RNA sequence: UUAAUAUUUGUUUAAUGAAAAGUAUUUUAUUAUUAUAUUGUAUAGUAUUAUUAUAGUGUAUAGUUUUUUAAAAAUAUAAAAAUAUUGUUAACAACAAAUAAAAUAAAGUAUGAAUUAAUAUCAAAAUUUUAAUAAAAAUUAAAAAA
């Protein structure tokens, strides 16, 4: 799942299992931008933690918002300024 | 009167819940700090049955 | 406590606490005998007296 | 082999088979010592 | 009443699974594979999926009155090393015919050879999409 | 066996008890006096020490049950299970609290003895 | 269309083996060499002796 | 191996005992008077009745945890509507408290403490005595050294049973 | 060691510790609101061999607060009177 | 695992206590007569659908239990242990046979 | 509709449109109030329907009216208690007559004859016990009466006690009275009546041991120990209690009484062997608790004190036979395995009587908590899965655990 | 009970409506706790 | 008798005020503020502790804490391939064949009804016949127990 900070809009992704279904709507997580404990809301949906029976790992998969959120922070136009310092594929 | 009382009760409950969550998060962070101190003092490392050479290789993460 | 009792046993030469205390109080009773030598509810109750005249 | 008693069929002490010519050309067998009375009852 | 479906005879109820360590089953399988290799019905192979799938395969099948010669990319493999149950999944497309073949190893009439020597995962993806589109199209509507 | 459904009971545990940091020297032949008290310890391992983070977590969870609201929850559970038809449940007037001052004092004395 | 069953029709269930194995049968037991209590082989006690060396 | 079990015919057919007409047993004046069960063979050294107050915990232990019993603290019907007792309980009351009937006291009263009187019937017949006490409303007399019975006094905390 | 206390939080937030504690229990226990009660927790008279059972004795914290009920839910007439 | 067996166990404990109070020998006791006959019963309503109802029968019974002394009784051996238990105790270090020590008889000579 | 009787106590199908009845949850049947309704009668106070009127006049009459005594009468009730000395004399005479009239058992050939029951002896012995403060075992009494020599010993000791009490009085009563008087405002030797009493109680305990009731034997020896004030008698009684506790698997009490008899050595007569028997009992208790080195040290000290009394020598030989094999198997007895193996049949019988069975009398049927029975769920010492204590929650106070899914 | 389960001693059938009425009753108990009503047993007399 | 029966089986809580209704022994239920007599505050109904959120305000992250069980058939739901059938649409519906994997519903420990009940410790089968199924008769035959 993808969560955003209520105060600043900082976004981070983390899959939610069956043991944390109660914390899927609202998460009380430490915000790196606010530098304190802030409330995080559910923004977009990821596939799942486990595997759907007799279905591949891709099913169901994240929504278009999660795929767009990743592509803006890590992709062709996103990693190009970062491929000149380390080229993460290598050290 | 009903409206005002209900809103005040819900607001106060929300504020008490926020305080409880903040205190519990602080206590859990202190707990993890003490746990890290004790692990470093006793030599315990939760990086598996192996040694630091595996983590230095960092082929498995 | 295990190694504590082990060190206790080693200090008292394998003699356990009960043996040590028994020997000490037996020596005490023997010294008491020496001092003596040198010096020389369940049952039923009866009826109480009448409360008044 | 906690339950396996050597020389006894399926761990039954009243079915002693040791010192008897039970031909087992590729399996070990133990000698016979007379069992005690308390082991059988 | 007048019949019986089960048998409780010792000969049939007894199983010999406990004594299978006296029989080298895997060694016998490898011996059969090596016999096939030395007879020439199959050639020894060792690869992973990521490096095998997507490679063109030239398959000549001895059929009367003329052997059929096809070229088709690897879509899947069933065994990493050589084995009598090796298996190979090949998608071959002719001028107007698209087919999905599963060629078993060790058949003297079905001589298939892998030639790419490499994987070509992108070519595998392209052939997968082509086969999917053709399969969905071929249904009558 | 469990009397309710006559199901077979199984004690499952870990093997290397002595090689562990926690549970070093714990005796499971009989449970503790209370479910929130630390488990039994053999006389040989009385001087053992536990990890401080786990000790603090257990102390917090145990102090949770030292309040009067827990005594009220206990009596209310008595009332609920008595209304639900469960037998051998005494009356909330006859019940007594699991945690009192003198009992807590002697349990603290025993905990300091076990260090 | 069922009718009342006589006492002899009721006792026919006792002649079967399914009735005897459920009701009329005893237990093979011995004294636990550690607890001195009656005990059936295969099941043990909640005790640090009877869990390591389970008799 | 298997224990011998036999179905009992009493569990298949056991009617009620023959009742008494006019509460008369037809052989009271013909048969001897022996305690019940002695001549039949019914004997017991100790009788434990699980309906007593002291056997409640044993009964509830022998019962199973699955079987539940409801209305333990309340009751469906209101228990504050006054209603009559059972017939046998009303008969017990009438048989015990007979002086509650109107004009039960004998008139005129002639028995006062200090009179010498003889017992004319019942146990201790023909014995003389002096009236000690007079229970006038019950029509009863306490005569001296007549009908002397043991008065059991229960044991208290600091006094034994006398 | 500084665990959360209802009284301490109420003293910090100025929220009437009684009312703060009532915020975390059913309303029928502290106010005159329609709520069902178990017949076992209600008091019963004394029997030979046992003392009397009182609901106020066996649940002192689960008592309705008339002061809080009137100051939160019931309406005052001093603000309504218009002579 | 039977409720009737539990009830008979309670009755056996009570009868054994009574026999020991009477003076009989515990190791020579034997169940001479065990029998049950019906006792008092209670009713309970069984409300059924479609406006029907029945009355369940809470049955109870009485139990007679006689313990008699039989000096000619020879009890079977119940101390025989399985080979698995024997060798497990051997592995642990315990003796396979229980340790028996001769105890001198009670003497009233010092009084 | 109406396939049976019309009363609510009937057993068949009824209907509301034809036979409407009021809601009767549970009521007694046609024969009598069953236990399922007497449970309510004792807990709730009335039958669970509420239509029955509670009529407890009979139990009121049995308890309250009986236990009611006016204060003016109870003030004088205590002033007419029977004389204790005369009561003891009469009880002793009756008990002696009832023991003397006991018939001699006839010894049959080929089978064991049943001993005559002690029917007329339970009441006189009850009066004797309640007058002397010491309980006598009926099994032990029966065994003493069966044994011809023990019966003669018991008769002689009881006659001596009778004569001494009738000629001089009750020395235990004198001691208690003098102690109470001294407390309101020393210790003499064991008198002849006390000697006869402890002698007959030792005979009863020996008969009880011959029967096989070690608990009752040890109890009789314990309540006989309270009548000896002489060092020799005390050492003998302590040795006897140690042996009885060894037989009853009371290792702690056996060791205590053995070391007490050993400590009574300096002030005892040199001819007595009670101290040797106490050392024997102490070493045997140690060996049963599996302290082999402790038992060897104790028996060595006992030998050095008494140079080789036969009992000490046999016990030392047995300990040496065990020591010639213990290092051949394990070099010692493990510490976590001591006092773990059962050795005696007394503890086997005790476990048979008070063990945990399959289904009941275990930690899954009912649990005890301060003289009250609880279900397996409401167990304050356990929070295993299925207990009510896993549903407590945070109680609206603070987050006690870091668990996210439960609690 | 192994021989009994093998030889089918007992009703080979079972109740079918319970695995759904159980969760229905659990949801109803949730609703009762919401409405501040005491929880009652699902089957007081049908047992 | 059915009945060794059907049925029950308490291991995890997402929501907030009346009145009708219910009177269950609130021992001083509350402890106080204001002012000013008097009066009254806890629990429905469907024969029940029952498929059940009574919708009168009002709004909301208090997780506002009773559902056993170690395989099977039939049945009940849900899913159900790169086989085939008919439509919508740019995945949805049923179907017939592999109708196949896989999910939920056990004895046994407990409690325990109801329909039903002329009846021998009931009689497998075949044939012939007799006043309507004939279990009524007769002749052949040979039919175990759970
Ligand atoms: Mg009502
Ligand atoms: Mg209602
Ligand atoms: Mg209805
Ligand atoms: Zn932020
Ligand atoms: Zn054991």
PDB file of C-alpha atoms in Angstrom, chain K residues 173-371:
ATOM      1  CA  UNK K 173      -4.264 -33.478  82.225  1.00  0.00           C
ATOM      2  CA  UNK K 174      -2.144 -32.465  85.222  1.00  0.00           C
ATOM      3  CA  UNK K 175       0.563 -31.106  82.911  1.00  0.00           C
ATOM      4  CA  UNK K 176      -1.920 -29.091  80.854  1.00  0.00           C
ATOM      5  CA  UNK K 177      -3.614 -27.711  83.975  1.00  0.00           C
ATOM      6  CA  UNK K 178      -0.289 -26.718  85.543  1.00  0.00           C
ATOM      7  CA  UNK K 179       0.883 -25.074  82.314  1.00  0.00           C
ATOM      8  CA  UNK K 180      -2.370 -23.111  82.051  1.00  0.00           C
ATOM      9  CA  UNK K 181      -2.107 -22.047  85.701  1.00  0.00           C
ATOM     10  CA  UNK K 182       1.510 -20.939  85.235  1.00  0.00           C
ATOM     11  CA  UNK K 183       0.477 -18.956  82.165  1.00  0.00           C
ATOM     12  CA  UNK K 184      -2.336 -17.355  84.156  1.00  0.00           C
ATOM     13  CA  UNK K 185       0.015 -16.380  86.997  1.00  0.00           C
ATOM     14  CA  UNK K 186       9.037 -27.151  85.180  1.00  0.00           C
ATOM     15  CA  UNK K 187       8.753 -30.484  83.344  1.00  0.00           C
ATOM     16  CA  UNK K 188       8.591 -33.817  85.147  1.00  0.00           C
ATOM     17  CA  UNK K 189       9.648 -37.161  83.709  1.00  0.00           C
ATOM     18  CA  UNK K 190       7.364 -39.457  81.730  1.00  0.00           C
ATOM     19  CA  UNK K 191       4.907 -40.931  84.224  1.00  0.00           C
ATOM     20  CA  UNK K 192       3.765 -44.552  84.301  1.00  0.00           C
ATOM     21  CA  UNK K 193       0.399 -43.834  82.670  1.00  0.00           C
ATOM     22  CA  UNK K 194       2.089 -41.860  79.886  1.00  0.00           C
ATOM     23  CA  UNK K 195       4.568 -44.713  79.425  1.00  0.00           C
ATOM     24  CA  UNK K 196       1.760 -47.266  79.127  1.00  0.00           C
ATOM     25  CA  UNK K 197      -0.099 -44.977  76.718  1.00  0.00           C
ATOM     26  CA  UNK K 198       2.861 -44.461  74.394  1.00  0.00           C
ATOM     27  CA  UNK K 199       3.583 -48.202  74.604  1.00  0.00           C
ATOM     28  CA  UNK K 200       0.071 -49.174  73.510  1.00  0.00           C
ATOM     29  CA  UNK K 201       0.155 -46.516  70.781  1.00  0.00           C
ATOM     30  CA  UNK K 202       3.456 -47.949  69.533  1.00  0.00           C
ATOM     31  CA  UNK K 203       1.829 -51.391  69.483  1.00  0.00           C
ATOM     32  CA  UNK K 204      -1.086 -49.962  67.484  1.00  0.00           C
ATOM     33  CA  UNK K 205       1.358 -48.373  65.036  1.00  0.00           C
ATOM     34  CA  UNK K 206       3.259 -51.650  64.648  1.00  0.00           C
ATOM     35  CA  UNK K 207      -0.009 -53.421  63.874  1.00  0.00           C
ATOM     36  CA  UNK K 208      -0.902 -50.681  61.399  1.00  0.00           C
ATOM     37  CA  UNK K 209       2.456 -51.167  59.667  1.00  0.00           C
ATOM     38  CA  UNK K 210       1.880 -54.929  59.539  1.00  0.00           C
ATOM     39  CA  UNK K 211      -1.445 -54.092  57.886  1.00  0.00           C
ATOM     40  CA  UNK K 212       0.144 -51.694  55.406  1.00  0.00           C
ATOM     41  CA  UNK K 213      -1.224 -48.266  56.355  1.00  0.00           C
ATOM     42  CA  UNK K 214       1.953 -46.240  56.753  1.00  0.00           C
ATOM     43  CA  UNK K 215       0.180 -42.870  56.884  1.00  0.00           C
ATOM     44  CA  UNK K 216      -1.967 -43.948  59.834  1.00  0.00           C
ATOM     45  CA  UNK K 217       1.038 -45.603  61.486  1.00  0.00           C
ATOM     46  CA  UNK K 218       3.020 -42.362  61.231  1.00  0.00           C
ATOM     47  CA  UNK K 219       0.030 -40.371  62.498  1.00  0.00           C
ATOM     48  CA  UNK K 220      -0.340 -42.616  65.556  1.00  0.00           C
ATOM     49  CA  UNK K 221       3.390 -42.329  66.229  1.00  0.00           C
ATOM     50  CA  UNK K 222       3.148 -38.542  65.865  1.00  0.00           C
ATOM     51  CA  UNK K 223       0.290 -38.181  68.340  1.00  0.00           C
ATOM     52  CA  UNK K 224       2.107 -40.597  70.665  1.00  0.00           C
ATOM     53  CA  UNK K 225       5.260 -38.454  70.525  1.00  0.00           C
ATOM     54  CA  UNK K 226       3.310 -35.734  72.363  1.00  0.00           C
ATOM     55  CA  UNK K 227       3.130 -37.903  75.510  1.00  0.00           C
ATOM     56  CA  UNK K 228       6.830 -38.718  76.033  1.00  0.00           C
ATOM     57  CA  UNK K 229       9.010 -36.257  77.953  1.00  0.00           C
ATOM     58  CA  UNK K 230      11.955 -38.675  78.569  1.00  0.00           C
ATOM     59  CA  UNK K 231      14.991 -38.661  76.245  1.00  0.00           C
ATOM     60  CA  UNK K 232      14.953 -42.445  75.739  1.00  0.00           C
ATOM     61  CA  UNK K 233      11.243 -42.524  74.897  1.00  0.00           C
ATOM     62  CA  UNK K 234      11.624 -39.492  72.630  1.00  0.00           C
ATOM     63  CA  UNK K 235      14.534 -41.060  70.739  1.00  0.00           C
ATOM     64  CA  UNK K 236      12.636 -44.332  70.304  1.00  0.00           C
ATOM     65  CA  UNK K 237       9.525 -42.500  69.098  1.00  0.00           C
ATOM     66  CA  UNK K 238      11.588 -40.401  66.684  1.00  0.00           C
ATOM     67  CA  UNK K 239      13.195 -43.526  65.221  1.00  0.00           C
ATOM     68  CA  UNK K 240       9.746 -45.096  64.844  1.00  0.00           C
ATOM     69  CA  UNK K 241       8.371 -41.977  63.132  1.00  0.00           C
ATOM     70  CA  UNK K 242      11.390 -41.937  60.818  1.00  0.00           C
ATOM     71  CA  UNK K 243      10.782 -45.554  59.799  1.00  0.00           C
ATOM     72  CA  UNK K 244       7.054 -44.935  59.305  1.00  0.00           C
ATOM     73  CA  UNK K 245       7.751 -41.866  57.163  1.00  0.00           C
ATOM     74  CA  UNK K 246      10.289 -43.830  55.117  1.00  0.00           C
ATOM     75  CA  UNK K 247       7.591 -46.424  54.439  1.00  0.00           C
ATOM     76  CA  UNK K 248       5.034 -43.686  53.677  1.00  0.00           C
ATOM     77  CA  UNK K 249       7.533 -41.945  51.335  1.00  0.00           C
ATOM     78  CA  UNK K 250       7.670 -38.914  53.654  1.00  0.00           C
ATOM     79  CA  UNK K 251      11.385 -38.387  53.135  1.00  0.00           C
ATOM     80  CA  UNK K 252      11.486 -34.916  54.707  1.00  0.00           C
ATOM     81  CA  UNK K 253       9.817 -36.009  57.940  1.00  0.00           C
ATOM     82  CA  UNK K 254      11.825 -39.234  57.984  1.00  0.00           C
ATOM     83  CA  UNK K 255      15.102 -37.312  57.744  1.00  0.00           C
ATOM     84  CA  UNK K 256      13.955 -34.831  60.397  1.00  0.00           C
ATOM     85  CA  UNK K 257      12.973 -37.537  62.885  1.00  0.00           C
ATOM     86  CA  UNK K 258      16.147 -39.503  62.166  1.00  0.00           C
ATOM     87  CA  UNK K 259      18.391 -36.534  62.864  1.00  0.00           C
ATOM     88  CA  UNK K 260      16.329 -35.761  65.981  1.00  0.00           C
ATOM     89  CA  UNK K 261      16.866 -39.301  67.275  1.00  0.00           C
ATOM     90  CA  UNK K 262      20.562 -38.894  66.452  1.00  0.00           C
ATOM     91  CA  UNK K 263      20.747 -35.581  68.336  1.00  0.00           C
ATOM     92  CA  UNK K 264      19.150 -37.266  71.358  1.00  0.00           C
ATOM     93  CA  UNK K 265      22.325 -39.384  71.704  1.00  0.00           C
ATOM     94  CA  UNK K 266      24.260 -37.575  74.496  1.00  0.00           C
ATOM     95  CA  UNK K 267      21.353 -37.606  76.977  1.00  0.00           C
ATOM     96  CA  UNK K 268      20.212 -41.188  76.290  1.00  0.00           C
ATOM     97  CA  UNK K 269      21.119 -44.436  78.006  1.00  0.00           C
ATOM     98  CA  UNK K 270      24.034 -46.262  76.322  1.00  0.00           C
ATOM     99  CA  UNK K 271      22.064 -49.510  75.943  1.00  0.00           C
ATOM    100  CA  UNK K 272      19.403 -47.975  73.686  1.00  0.00           C
ATOM    101  CA  UNK K 273      19.707 -48.364  69.915  1.00  0.00           C
ATOM    102  CA  UNK K 274      17.228 -45.592  69.069  1.00  0.00           C
ATOM    103  CA  UNK K 275      20.067 -43.307  67.964  1.00  0.00           C
ATOM    104  CA  UNK K 276      21.457 -46.010  65.676  1.00  0.00           C
ATOM    105  CA  UNK K 277      17.982 -46.487  64.201  1.00  0.00           C
ATOM    106  CA  UNK K 278      17.736 -42.721  63.730  1.00  0.00           C
ATOM    107  CA  UNK K 279      21.021 -42.673  61.826  1.00  0.00           C
ATOM    108  CA  UNK K 280      19.717 -45.577  59.729  1.00  0.00           C
ATOM    109  CA  UNK K 281      16.518 -43.688  58.941  1.00  0.00           C
ATOM    110  CA  UNK K 282      18.426 -40.510  58.093  1.00  0.00           C
ATOM    111  CA  UNK K 283      20.759 -42.333  55.702  1.00  0.00           C
ATOM    112  CA  UNK K 284      17.818 -44.176  54.136  1.00  0.00           C
ATOM    113  CA  UNK K 285      15.935 -40.913  53.585  1.00  0.00           C
ATOM    114  CA  UNK K 286      19.053 -39.460  51.960  1.00  0.00           C
ATOM    115  CA  UNK K 287      19.430 -42.497  49.692  1.00  0.00           C
ATOM    116  CA  UNK K 288      15.750 -42.314  48.724  1.00  0.00           C
ATOM    117  CA  UNK K 289      16.217 -38.631  47.895  1.00  0.00           C
ATOM    118  CA  UNK K 290      19.151 -39.971  45.819  1.00  0.00           C
ATOM    119  CA  UNK K 291      21.909 -38.255  47.823  1.00  0.00           C
ATOM    120  CA  UNK K 292      24.277 -41.215  47.801  1.00  0.00           C
ATOM    121  CA  UNK K 293      27.339 -39.330  49.052  1.00  0.00           C
ATOM    122  CA  UNK K 294      25.244 -37.774  51.826  1.00  0.00           C
ATOM    123  CA  UNK K 295      23.908 -41.204  52.804  1.00  0.00           C
ATOM    124  CA  UNK K 296      27.441 -42.619  52.827  1.00  0.00           C
ATOM    125  CA  UNK K 297      28.679 -39.790  55.054  1.00  0.00           C
ATOM    126  CA  UNK K 298      25.727 -40.245  57.420  1.00  0.00           C
ATOM    127  CA  UNK K 299      26.172 -44.014  57.670  1.00  0.00           C
ATOM    128  CA  UNK K 300      29.927 -43.587  58.187  1.00  0.00           C
ATOM    129  CA  UNK K 301      29.349 -41.156  61.055  1.00  0.00           C
ATOM    130  CA  UNK K 302      26.766 -43.567  62.447  1.00  0.00           C
ATOM    131  CA  UNK K 303      29.214 -46.470  62.277  1.00  0.00           C
ATOM    132  CA  UNK K 304      31.964 -44.455  63.974  1.00  0.00           C
ATOM    133  CA  UNK K 305      29.526 -43.510  66.740  1.00  0.00           C
ATOM    134  CA  UNK K 306      28.176 -47.066  67.003  1.00  0.00           C
ATOM    135  CA  UNK K 307      31.085 -49.262  65.866  1.00  0.00           C
ATOM    136  CA  UNK K 308      29.022 -51.469  63.579  1.00  0.00           C
ATOM    137  CA  UNK K 309      25.523 -52.217  64.839  1.00  0.00           C
ATOM    138  CA  UNK K 310      23.866 -54.748  62.522  1.00  0.00           C
ATOM    139  CA  UNK K 311      21.326 -52.335  61.016  1.00  0.00           C
ATOM    140  CA  UNK K 312      23.992 -49.735  60.231  1.00  0.00           C
ATOM    141  CA  UNK K 313      26.216 -52.446  58.744  1.00  0.00           C
ATOM    142  CA  UNK K 314      23.455 -53.765  56.477  1.00  0.00           C
ATOM    143  CA  UNK K 315      22.559 -50.244  55.347  1.00  0.00           C
ATOM    144  CA  UNK K 316      26.229 -49.513  54.631  1.00  0.00           C
ATOM    145  CA  UNK K 317      26.514 -52.744  52.636  1.00  0.00           C
ATOM    146  CA  UNK K 318      23.454 -51.769  50.587  1.00  0.00           C
ATOM    147  CA  UNK K 319      24.860 -48.283  49.970  1.00  0.00           C
ATOM    148  CA  UNK K 320      28.173 -49.830  48.907  1.00  0.00           C
ATOM    149  CA  UNK K 321      26.351 -52.189  46.540  1.00  0.00           C
ATOM    150  CA  UNK K 322      24.698 -49.138  44.973  1.00  0.00           C
ATOM    151  CA  UNK K 323      28.023 -47.254  44.864  1.00  0.00           C
ATOM    152  CA  UNK K 324      29.745 -50.146  43.084  1.00  0.00           C
ATOM    153  CA  UNK K 325      27.339 -49.568  40.170  1.00  0.00           C
ATOM    154  CA  UNK K 326      26.456 -45.854  40.085  1.00  0.00           C
ATOM    155  CA  UNK K 327      29.831 -44.749  38.593  1.00  0.00           C
ATOM    156  CA  UNK K 328      29.628 -47.708  36.202  1.00  0.00           C
ATOM    157  CA  UNK K 329      26.527 -46.108  34.613  1.00  0.00           C
ATOM    158  CA  UNK K 330      26.548 -42.347  35.188  1.00  0.00           C
ATOM    159  CA  UNK K 331      29.397 -41.463  37.634  1.00  0.00           C
ATOM    160  CA  UNK K 332      26.700 -39.860  39.833  1.00  0.00           C
ATOM    161  CA  UNK K 333      22.956 -39.261  39.954  1.00  0.00           C
ATOM    162  CA  UNK K 334      22.061 -36.133  37.934  1.00  0.00           C
ATOM    163  CA  UNK K 335      20.973 -33.101  39.927  1.00  0.00           C
ATOM    164  CA  UNK K 336      17.859 -32.439  37.827  1.00  0.00           C
ATOM    165  CA  UNK K 337      16.862 -36.113  38.211  1.00  0.00           C
ATOM    166  CA  UNK K 338      17.078 -36.518  41.996  1.00  0.00           C
ATOM    167  CA  UNK K 339      13.945 -37.429  43.998  1.00  0.00           C
ATOM    168  CA  UNK K 340      12.206 -38.002  40.651  1.00  0.00           C
ATOM    169  CA  UNK K 341      11.843 -41.790  40.392  1.00  0.00           C
ATOM    170  CA  UNK K 342       9.238 -43.620  42.455  1.00  0.00           C
ATOM    171  CA  UNK K 343      10.559 -46.477  44.584  1.00  0.00           C
ATOM    172  CA  UNK K 344       7.785 -47.519  46.992  1.00  0.00           C
ATOM    173  CA  UNK K 345       4.238 -48.839  46.473  1.00  0.00           C
ATOM    174  CA  UNK K 346       2.830 -46.352  48.998  1.00  0.00           C
ATOM    175  CA  UNK K 347       3.375 -43.460  46.598  1.00  0.00           C
ATOM    176  CA  UNK K 348       2.015 -45.629  43.776  1.00  0.00           C
ATOM    177  CA  UNK K 349      -1.234 -46.102  45.698  1.00  0.00           C
ATOM    178  CA  UNK K 350      -1.258 -42.395  46.574  1.00  0.00           C
ATOM    179  CA  UNK K 351      -0.873 -41.490  42.901  1.00  0.00           C
ATOM    180  CA  UNK K 352      -3.610 -43.929  41.917  1.00  0.00           C
ATOM    181  CA  UNK K 353      -5.910 -42.265  44.447  1.00  0.00           C
ATOM    182  CA  UNK K 354      -5.036 -38.610  43.787  1.00  0.00           C
ATOM    183  CA  UNK K 355      -3.616 -38.396  40.265  1.00  0.00           C
ATOM    184  CA  UNK K 356      -4.769 -36.572  37.153  1.00  0.00           C
ATOM    185  CA  UNK K 357      -6.991 -38.745  34.978  1.00  0.00           C
ATOM    186  CA  UNK K 358      -7.978 -38.615  31.321  1.00  0.00           C
ATOM    187  CA  UNK K 359     -10.737 -36.022  31.188  1.00  0.00           C
ATOM    188  CA  UNK K 360     -11.272 -35.148  34.850  1.00  0.00           C
ATOM    189  CA  UNK K 361      -9.090 -34.151  37.814  1.00  0.00           C
ATOM    190  CA  UNK K 362      -6.624 -32.545  35.379  1.00  0.00           C
ATOM    191  CA  UNK K 363      -5.676 -28.978  34.471  1.00  0.00           C
ATOM    192  CA  UNK K 364      -8.323 -28.989  31.713  1.00  0.00           C
ATOM    193  CA  UNK K 365     -11.514 -30.001  33.569  1.00  0.00           C
ATOM    194  CA  UNK K 366     -11.763 -27.674  36.584  1.00  0.00           C
ATOM    195  CA  UNK K 367      -9.193 -25.500  38.337  1.00  0.00           C
ATOM    196  CA  UNK K 368      -9.144 -24.504  41.998  1.00  0.00           C
ATOM    197  CA  UNK K 369      -8.689 -20.853  42.964  1.00  0.00           C
ATOM    198  CA  UNK K 370      -9.032 -19.989  46.672  1.00  0.00           C
ATOM    199  CA  UNK K 371     -11.379 -22.832  47.643  1.00  0.00           C
TER     200      UNK K 371
END
